[PDB]
Each structure stands twice: as C-alpha cells, then as structure tokens.
Write a protein that binds this ligand. Structure first.
Ligand SMILES: CC(=O)N[C@@H]1[C@@H](O[C@H](C)C(=O)O)[C@H](O)[C@@H](CO)O[C@H]1O
Ligand SMILES: *[C@@H]1O[C@H](CO)[C@@H](O)[C@H](O)[C@H]1NC(C)=O
Length: 246
C-alpha cells in the first residue's frame, strides 16, 4: 500500500507520496526510459490501496487500478463507494469486501461525467493540498454532489500527479493555497492516453509519433508534439498506459 498524511504535509512529503505511488505500479518494461504499465493484472493484485489522512487524522482508503491509475472506489469507515462502471463493479469483487455496506455512486469515474455531477468543469475547481484535505473530509460522509467535486480533486492530486511531473510540481506550488489548474495541466490530463500511445508507436518509427499530439504549454500557447525528443516525453510523463488498453 501507499499512504499520505495532510497533517504536517509539505512539498517534500507530498513528493515522497507521489514517488511512492509511481513505485507501487508494476511494470516489466520501459519505453524511452518510461515505465510501461501492464496490459493486465488478474485478481486482487490489480488494485493498489492508497491510505489518505486528512488534517484531523481521519482516513479513507482509495482503490486504484495499477494498469491505468484509475480510481475505482474508496472506503470511508464501514462503507465502501464505487463508481457506476463495470471496471469498478469488478473491483468491488476484490477490495473493501469487509465494509458493512456498499454504495454505488450515481456516476462513472470519467471527467465528463464527474463534471456534470459536480455542476462545474474542473477548470473552475481549485486544487492543491488544502483542496485534497477538503476532498478526503467530504468523502467521509456520503453526499454524491459534493463527492463528485472532491473526486475531481482527488483524481488530479493523486493519479494525474503520478502520471506527470509537471502536475506533481503544480500541486507542490499549491501546498498551502489552492489554485484552479493551469490550462497546460488540463491539456496533459486529457492527452495521457494519446501520448502513451504515440510514445509506444514511436518504437518502430525512429522516435517519431505516427500522429502528432497537441498540447497547451506552461506559458499558455498551443503546441504540437511530434517525437520522443520533446520535453513532454524526456522529462514530464512518468507512466505509459499500455496500447493494449487503448
Ligand atoms: C468512455 C470512458 O468512460 N472511458 C474511460 C473508462 O474506460 C477506459 C478508457 C478503458 O477502456 O478501460 C475508465 O474505466 C474510466 C475510469 O473511471 O475513465 C474513462 O475515461
Ligand atoms: C522532434 O521534436 C523536436 C522538439 O519539438 C522538434 O524540434 C523536431 O522538429 C522534431 N523532429 C521531427 C523529425 O519530428
């Protein structure tokens, strides 16, 4: 398992947590020196448990699919909660079976569906370490509308930060004051599958993307990523979604 404590958290302890989370995800191969996540894992091993503690020391445990870093569900005291999607229902066959009761959330886990439930796009939701403390607190007691916004925070400050060092750094700059994510952050989130795929296609194609990926850069301008020499690939992306799952 991996763990993170908000009580006393700072850029350094958060960086250690994100390091721990990346490290918990199995791979047999690196592509362009990036860990390539597995095509599949069978059974309960496919799920990582993340124990998160709010400032008061209250906790939830979040179940993450190790093949794609997707949040499937979470446990808060004796109640488990899972997204309304088949991969989550499958996960509920393996994790938090000890819970007194299980709630299926009234949305799936994808951004569009969560934003609808939440009533705002994530462009308008501040993220940061304080926002994460709030999200854990919220998820402690069932409220599906508030839970959708908390889950948008939780997904970006955990999974998206594991995927991209730029996102991890953005959260680090937000250790003590929340801020809506940069449009570059939004762009990388939305491009993860495409980038992972193109980085994979680049082997067998001289480091060259078969199809270019358009990102917004951390200076606000729109740009094209065409090969493995881009800073996005050499320094930023930390994990590859395997093309079998794409
Ligand atoms: C159309 C849709 O909802 N896609 C994915 C789901 O499926 C992926 C791509 C798959 O092919 O396994 C995934 O389970 C959820 C995670 O909660 O996020 C969505 O972005
Ligand atoms: C490779 O990517 C670099 C970085 O943007 C770019 O300057 C160069 O034009 C690209 N080369 C090819 C062949 O795509």
């Amino acid at each position: 398992d991996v763990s993170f404590r908000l009580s006393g958290a700072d850029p350094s302890s958060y960086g250690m947590f994100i390091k721990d989370l990346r490290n918990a995800l199995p791979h047999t191969e690196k592509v362009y020196n990036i860990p390539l996540l597995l095509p599949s894992v069978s059974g309960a091993g496919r799920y990582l448990l993340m124990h998160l503690f709010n400032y008061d020391g209250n906790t939830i445990t979040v179940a993450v699919d190790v093949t794609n870093v997707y949040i499937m569900g979470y446990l808060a005291l004796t109640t488990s909660y899972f997204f309304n999607e088949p991969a989550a229902d499958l996960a509920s066959q393996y994790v938090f079976r000890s819970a007194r009761r299980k709630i299926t959330l009234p949305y799936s886990g994808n951004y569009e569906r969560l934003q609808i439930a939440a009533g705002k796009p994530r462009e308008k939701i501040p993220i940061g370490l304080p926002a994460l403390d709030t999200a854990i607190s919220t998820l402690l007691h069932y409220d599906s509308t508030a839970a959708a916004g908390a889950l948008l925070v939780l997904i970006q400050t955990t999974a998206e930060a594991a995927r991209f060092k730029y996102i991890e750094q953005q959260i680090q700059e937000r250790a003590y004051r929340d801020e809506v994510p940069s449009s570059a952050t939004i762009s990388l989130e939305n491009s993860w599958s495409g980038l992972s795929k193109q980085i994979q296609l680049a082997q067998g194609n001289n480091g060259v993307f078969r199809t270019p990926t358009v990102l917004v850069d951390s200076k606000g301008n729109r740009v094209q990523i065409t090969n493995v020499t881009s800073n996005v690939v050499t320094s930023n992306i930390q994990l590859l979604l395997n093309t079998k799952n794409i």
